[PDB]
C-alpha cells in the first residue's frame, strides 16, 4: 500500500504499488514508475 506519487528513490520495486522502479543511474537510487 505504497502508491507513491512522483518517481521517488527506492531500493526494491515493491517500494511502489506500480512496482516498476528503475535505477539507470550511478547510485542505487531507483525511481518509482
What are the residues facing 10 on neighbouring strands? 30
- Give the cell for residue 18: 506500480
* Structural domain span for residue 19: 1-33
Whether the CA torsion 2, 6, 7, 9 is positive or negative: it is negative
Query: Is there a contact between 24 and 31 (Cβ–Cβ < 8 Å)?
Result: no
The count of structural domains within the chain is 1
CB 21 within 8 A of CB 12: yes
The Cβ-side half-sphere exposure at 21, using a 13 Å CA radius, reads: 22
> 3-10 long-range contacts, Cβ below 8 Å, gap at least 24?
4/32, 6/32, 7/31, 7/32, 7/33, 8/32
> Is 13:31 a contact under the CB 8 Å cutoff?
no
Instruction: Give how far the C-alpha of residue 17 lies from the chain's centroid of Cα atoms, to the nearest Å.
Output: 10
Amino acid at each position: 500500500g505504497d502508491c507513491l506519487p512522483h518517481l521517488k528513490l527506492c531500493k526494491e520495486n515493491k517500494d511502489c504499488c506500480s512496482k516498476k522502479c528503475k535505477r539507470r543511474g550511478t547510485n542505487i537510487e531507483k525511481r518509482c514508475r
